[PDB]
Amino acid sequence: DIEGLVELLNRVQSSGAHDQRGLLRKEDLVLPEFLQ
Amino acid sequence: GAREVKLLLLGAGESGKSTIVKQMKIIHEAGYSEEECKQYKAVVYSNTIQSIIAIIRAMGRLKIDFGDSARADDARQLFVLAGAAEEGFMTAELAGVIKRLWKDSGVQACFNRSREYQLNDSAAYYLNDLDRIAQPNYIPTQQDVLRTRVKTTGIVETHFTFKDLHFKMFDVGGQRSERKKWIHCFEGVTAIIFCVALSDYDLVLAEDEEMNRMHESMKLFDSICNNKWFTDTSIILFLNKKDLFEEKIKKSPLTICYPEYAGSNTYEEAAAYIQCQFEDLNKRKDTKEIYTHFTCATDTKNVQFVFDAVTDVIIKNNLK
Numbered sequence: 228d229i230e231g232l233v234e235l236l237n238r239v240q241s242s243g244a245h246d247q248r249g250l251l252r253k254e255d256l257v258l259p260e261f262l263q
Numbered sequence: 264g265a266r267e268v269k270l271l272l273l274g275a276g277e278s279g280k281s282t283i284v285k286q287m288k289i290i291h292e293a294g295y296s297e298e299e300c301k302q303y304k305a306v307v308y309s310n311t312i313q314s315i316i317a318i319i320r321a322m323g324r325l326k327i328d329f330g331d332s333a334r335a336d337d338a339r340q341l342f343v344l345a346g347a348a349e350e351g352f353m354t355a356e357l358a359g360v361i362k363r364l365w366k367d368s369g370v371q372a373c374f375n376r377s378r379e380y381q382l383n384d385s386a387a388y389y390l391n392d393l394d395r396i397a398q399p400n401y402i403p404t405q406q407d408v409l410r411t412r413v414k415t416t417g418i419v420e421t422h423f424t425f426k427d428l429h430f431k432m433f434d435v436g437g438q439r440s441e442r443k444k445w446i447h448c449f450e451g452v453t454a455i456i457f458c459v460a461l462s463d464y465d466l467v468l469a470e471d472e473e474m475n476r477m478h479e480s481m482k483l484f485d486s487i488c489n490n491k492w493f494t495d496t497s498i499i500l501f502l503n504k505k506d507l508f509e510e511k512i513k514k515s516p517l518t519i520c521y522p523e524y525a526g527s528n529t530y531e532e533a534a535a536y537i538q539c540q541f542e543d544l545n546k547r548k549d550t551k552e553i554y555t556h557f558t559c560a561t562d563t564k565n566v567q568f569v570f571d572a573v574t575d576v577i578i579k580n581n582l583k
């Protein structure tokens with residue numbers, strides 16, 4: 228419905244590695260639980 | 264007259280869209296001056312640290328222990344040092360912490376099972392060059408800059424003239440867009456460059472996905488090339504990361520992605536099989552022609568050669 232395609236585009240083009248793109252941020256620095 | 268050539272890059276996240284854009288700048292524009300390169304030192308270090316952290320997090324999730332129990336303190340230290348490090352510089356302390364972790368056999372074991380989580384493809388590039396990158400007198404090379412990963416805020420675009428054509432390359436990538444925005448992106452498109460990460464074929468299924476990454480990509484390529492609105496638009500297909508695919512095909516069978524694959528596990532037959540899977544989705548092989556190229560978006564020479572061939576197609580496809 229093009230609206231369906233649009234949905235597919237947002238879903239496909241947004242997937243992928245997270246927290247691995249900008250400058251370092253306090254959010255990417257949280258300590259993994261197994262290391263506490 | 265120098266007509267406008269509107270190029271739209273489409274494809275899943277991490278398929279190489281941002282990279283293709285930067286290659287255009289390097290190939291058909293001024294590229295990056297040393298002064299500009301120095302500006303990327305901070306993102307180079309950020310990406311380097313994000314990479315080692317991603318692997319560390321996976322070790323906890325996948326329950327993979329460090330080869331040496333001592334590395335645990337390094338991991339914690341990694342997080343504190345990084346959190347206090349000034350953007351742009353890397354202390355001998357943090358450099359050592361990272362070099363020791365990257366060296367750990369447990370860390371390497373997790374790195375080698377990256378198909379089970381989501382690790383950016385610049386991780387190894389930087390992590391292996393810690394000698395060069397860590398040095399205080401470090402100046403990012405053009406290739407280093409190409410490998411950087413930055414914040415994608417809204418639609419990205421780049422201008423450049425090639426063979427008397429005014430190219431306008433667009434990449435919506437990542438930024439979730441509304442139907443209106445997409446329609447505007449599509450209207451006027453002269454050619455679509457659909458990027459596919461070949462190396463995504465062995466990725467473990469996520470909790471909320473019905474089909475693997477490759478088939479999701481196929482589903483989208485199917486809608487795009489068969490959509491009547493693009494009948495006249497040149498559909499270029501970039502089967503990217505051929506270099507990573509080639510390295511992987513050795514250990515991870517294509518049968519992971521296509522359970523029905525009965526061919527050999529050579530780069531050649533696996534790649535060909537994937538080319539056919541995508542191209543066969545075309546429901547009008549008589550009408551539309553798909554222009555497929557196997558690429559390595561991070562290889563300027565390869566991209567140059569390929570974009571050169573894509574241009575010849577745009578020209579002649581212009582029924583002239």
Ligand SMILES: Nc1nc2c(ncn2[C@@H]2O[C@H](COP(=O)(O)OP(=O)(O)O)[C@@H](O)[C@H]2O)c(=O)[nH]1
Nearest residue numbers: 276277278279280281282384385504559560561
């Ligand atoms: N080895 C290798 N890495 C690639 C290739 N193309 C892209 N990459 C890397 O893979 C990641 C892909 O994401 P990116 O290029 O930002 O594009 P996007 O997310 O699809 O827009 C980047 O970290 C690139 O450096 C390729 O052909 N070979």
Ligand SMILES: [Mg+2]
Nearest residue numbers: 276277436437
């Ligand atoms: Mg992206």
